[PDB]
Amino acid sequence: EVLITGLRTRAVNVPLAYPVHTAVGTVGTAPLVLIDLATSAGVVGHSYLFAYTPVALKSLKQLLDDMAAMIVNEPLAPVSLEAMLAKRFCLAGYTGLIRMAAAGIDMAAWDALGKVHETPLVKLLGANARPVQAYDSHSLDGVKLATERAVTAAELGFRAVKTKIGYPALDQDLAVVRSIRQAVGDDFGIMVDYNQSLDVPAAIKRSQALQQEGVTWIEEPTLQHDYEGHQRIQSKLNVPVQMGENWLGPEEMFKALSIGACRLAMPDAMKIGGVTGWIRASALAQQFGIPMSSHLFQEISAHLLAATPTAHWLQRLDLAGSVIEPTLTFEGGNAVIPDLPGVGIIWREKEIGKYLV
Amino acid sequence: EVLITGLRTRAVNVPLAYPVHTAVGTVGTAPLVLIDLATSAGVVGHSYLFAYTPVALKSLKQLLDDMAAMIVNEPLAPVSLEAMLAKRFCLAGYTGLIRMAAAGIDMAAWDALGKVHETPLVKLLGANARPVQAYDSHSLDGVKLATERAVTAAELGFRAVKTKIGYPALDQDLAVVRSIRQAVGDDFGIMVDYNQSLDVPAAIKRSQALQQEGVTWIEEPTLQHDYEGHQRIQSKLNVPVQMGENWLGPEEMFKALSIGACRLAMPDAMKIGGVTGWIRASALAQQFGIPMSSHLFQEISAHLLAATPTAHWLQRLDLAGSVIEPTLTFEGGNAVIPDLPGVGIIWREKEIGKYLV
Amino acid sequence: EVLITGLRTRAVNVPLAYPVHTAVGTVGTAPLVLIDLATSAGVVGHSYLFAYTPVALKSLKQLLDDMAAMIVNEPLAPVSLEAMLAKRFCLAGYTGLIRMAAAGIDMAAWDALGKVHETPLVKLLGANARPVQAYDSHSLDGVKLATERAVTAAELGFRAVKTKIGYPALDQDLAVVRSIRQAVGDDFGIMVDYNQSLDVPAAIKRSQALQQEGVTWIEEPTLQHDYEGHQRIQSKLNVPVQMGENWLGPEEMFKALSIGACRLAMPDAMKIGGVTGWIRASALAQQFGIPMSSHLFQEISAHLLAATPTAHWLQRLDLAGSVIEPTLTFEGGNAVIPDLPGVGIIWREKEIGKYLV
Amino acid sequence: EVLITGLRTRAVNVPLAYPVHTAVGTVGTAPLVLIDLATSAGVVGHSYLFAYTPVALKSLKQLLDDMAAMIVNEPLAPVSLEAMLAKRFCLAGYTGLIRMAAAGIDMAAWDALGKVHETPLVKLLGANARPVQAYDSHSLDGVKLATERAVTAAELGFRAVKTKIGYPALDQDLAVVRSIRQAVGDDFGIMVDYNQSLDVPAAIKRSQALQQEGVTWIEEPTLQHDYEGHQRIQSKLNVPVQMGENWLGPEEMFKALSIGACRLAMPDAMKIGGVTGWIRASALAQQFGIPMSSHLFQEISAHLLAATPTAHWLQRLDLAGSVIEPTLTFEGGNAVIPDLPGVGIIWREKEIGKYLV
């Protein structure tokens, strides 16, 4: 009855409100692929993908353009659709870019399904909208900018911020954390992210020092694929190890959880497999007793977390703000799902034109 | 926006088309509780519960009548509803009758949600209807009746039947299986169910003898709660051990799968937690690499299996046929989801009146 | 020779001497089912069941009334009786309400058996009465009431109290514990109960802070069915994790102990399976090296603990005091078994009439 | 001293000498990306990539074109190069297409390094050329074509063939194997590949039946990422389970071997990480006691296997034969490394022009 009738993609490089500082340099734009899924019902589903680096941008888009053929004229049944794609890409490898691409389609399919039924996604999922606590996500900023950004966050009502650490010396790491703490007060949450930058022993050493500072969590201390190493680090800490942003599919999540690699999880709506993947991941998290946060995709994550039994935090990091309407709002540090069919993603066409690649 | 406005239950004892023969005697009726969930939208959700024994019938109904208060005036958000109930019953114990009761409400909530959206449940779930292979479910019938019933099944187009075994002597067990095989032919599926009747060593001995006969699976050889014993039995067999009908919630399923207690699973829509529980169970099954079949509740199971990544068999066992319209049909041994909003459960009011308890 | 001749049940809502404060509100009554088991010998056995919530009260009673038939005219052989019931309810699920019901019958059967032999239960069990140290059980009371109640306990001679914690903030938790400690002195026992209210990481964090305060034990930090989570929490602590109140049967206890989920146990005479279940549980506790305390049912628990090899504490919490004679006494913080045949439960009929439901 | 000066890629769809038959249909072409790595020394390194499906072809090429920038002006030090890329793609995910791309560069870098030193790759690797036993790789051909192809193989001197199985019915599987055996004789090797097509229980059942036929190995019985499932299947067999073609990097291989998922391995030079990845994989295989075969890339695999301590079989499957010189030869079923610097890959430019995409 409801069919998929077309797929259109547009590659853009959009300005970032909060320039991300790295050891490498300063990056003020994000490589995104915007997706429009047309249907026989007159509704158009929308999603976006994050490419991480501009090196992968055009390849991503082209990959989508080339997959369009397999999905056109198929029913708008996201679950059935995902299984078909999993089977089409089983030799090539259903992971990495291919998996990211499929996830973009899933997310758009689900947004369209919500439009057909005139209902917010969260409601289609069987749950009620609820406000979700969010933390403001910052970067490898230095003591001055880090504290600054943290003070503003608090001013805007957030009760937690995340900072990137992993300086050449541990003492720099500690300097950042201390200055934030001194400025925001003793309760406030301070999450730290190492971005896979340390080896196991270094991780244990730096982390035990942070643990004494009072951090909320320690995120991705070592190489993401090294589940066993994360487990070793975790085993020497009281503070929780957080991870999950790099899991491609619930099957990677399953592996990591099976060995007790972490005490917290934070899947990425895109890497986990879209709405379909998230729902699977949320069941795993519940069973393993793991509090589940989100990574990127703030708009859809708000919906997804409201339906998650072990929902923990929402990551505030606005990637697509320059080309979308501001329907998701933050009131007293909690994200508010807009009362709009689907995900509530509405393009700012005029702006898109500016960033086109 | 859409609220739950009332709950009405009716306890009945309905005639069974296929009298179930047991070691105890012959039982021709089923103790069921029929549920009607009213909503602010004008739609009425429907489900039924199976009480197993008439000893538990009135208690079940009364338990529902007493819970009505906690759900009335709550939004029709099955996922949110389940979490609320899990928290209300956490001291008393969210399992057994209480859990069965909550599952009845879940199933009705989901049927109503489908009505509000004018869509079949399977579609609301994100999948397409597909035909599901079914097996005809029989009892501890004796050689004559067992073969008879099996011949009729084949005549009606089924490609598999399940028989109950567990006679005083192994040789009786084998006599039943052989006569069926001789009558239906070498391909046909023959599933056997021990109904928790043996001890571990007996189980291993009888099962190895059956394995040589050519059975499809060996179901519940020993006490259901003994996961470790099932694992021991499984470890000495090539044929698959099947289990799951007695798991109360996905958390029991998780325990059993964690220790490799079986190679097949067959949750009961009621005991697993309704639609909400099934969806969770299906994610677990996928991750552990377990083919998932259903137990009872044929009407809703047809929908649920179409959305299950590792869907295996549908159990044909008509409990409520005397008081419901025949919307689910069997065409060439596969179950066909009716094209009707919700689950497609429609009462035969006039008949209900007859069976009322 | 001695037969069971009848079963009569009465549902009551009795006033509580110590109103239990919860996050929800104040509850001053308990939903109980009082049981009378008649025999051919002229003796009448007595027990009671706790329903937790009034939502389950009528269902419980009705369930008992409906089981009466299976037990009448059966010999007064509690062990044989339990096995029969386990087999009758094997499809429906021998757990939850059904199991609680069976346990009520067990307890009454054992009380009657003691009457037939004119001997206190403890003696029928092969042991001598001994005084058992008890702790006074309080609730989520706030700093003021908590300290108050604790001072009175000490005044009455108790050497330990249990308080419920799990406030929105850890610091509230600590405030309660500190004020009690300050008031009762440094030796006194302070047991804390989280009532399944935290997630694993929160549990580890709060518990390590309490451990520094000097608490006796940490009870049910997370969801009761999550044995593996309890093990994780336990693994990061020196203080003992206590659990067991929610185990339905010794088979659940066996599972939890098998994975080292706790260092202390505290089965509930009702949930564990009555006298028959307790005796089994006590053997397990001995073998696993676990000190065993009781949960509720103070009257019978006094007898049961005197026969328990690893007996630890008796929980003083008077549920049925308003409708029973005060035969169990407390002398210098130890419970004294009354010298009376059976359990020494004697109804205050006139009061019962008042609370009838 | 020796620098990388440029990267040129060409996407082609080349005819296959042996049309691969699938359940889907007949495919007579291969989507390949041909790579030319220019250097400051005047030498040009060559490699090719296999895209599996034409859906991924253009995306692959574009991805390479976009990475060219990061490698140009870098020294020709394949080991150092790989580490740089691993670090550049750590957020995006160093797996899937990105990893395949990097592997193409590695292979070309190593071919160029051999050219600079005027030596065959195998010799640069520290080993001597040796002839490697090869098996002729066929498809899901049917009884007639399968036997035919097998008879020709034997005629050309091969001592083993691989066939694809996984028919709707087991009996079809067995029919293929039997007819081959009957035609080639009792010694001859018959390898079978299920191509991830079965579930665990089906896998165990079909495999035990094959094991009785006398097959050389059972390849990829179930989903590639399910290491644990492969282990279960392996555990019920004497015949070896073979796997490895889908491992992306030695880190995936490490995971699978750690749990004993198989008794044989067969990494793909491209998916494993090129020359650099293969060398790492070969050390793992040696330590775990695993015989190591190759998957695709026959030209380079000949070199790689000669340097592999546990070398087992070379897979003969000519993907790029239409656009390259025939320097690798087969003499009496063994592959002979050509005596030519590098890998000995020489384009047939005139033919390339024909297949360009």
Ligand SMILES: C[C@@](O)(C(=O)O)c1ccccc1
């Ligand atoms: C640093 C990060 O890992 C995070 O979680 O914030 C991140 C990863 C990828 C893109 C943006 C941010």
Ligand SMILES: C[C@@](O)(C(=O)O)c1ccccc1
């Ligand atoms: C025998 C049974 O276990 C089955 O699976 O068929 C069954 C159990 C409970 C009610 C009816 C049938």
Ligand SMILES: C[C@@](O)(C(=O)O)c1ccccc1
């Ligand atoms: C709080 C509690 O868990 C305890 O152990 O005291 C409790 C549980 C159930 C009823 C009363 C008290």
Ligand SMILES: C[C@@](O)(C(=O)O)c1ccccc1
């Ligand atoms: C069937 C296969 O798995 C093999 O090993 O031969 C194969 C996989 C991918 C491309 C070609 C061949």
Ligand SMILES: [Mg+2]
């Ligand atoms: Mg991160």
Ligand SMILES: [Mg+2]
């Ligand atoms: Mg069964």
Ligand SMILES: [Mg+2]
């Ligand atoms: Mg408690």
Ligand SMILES: [Mg+2]
């Ligand atoms: Mg293969």
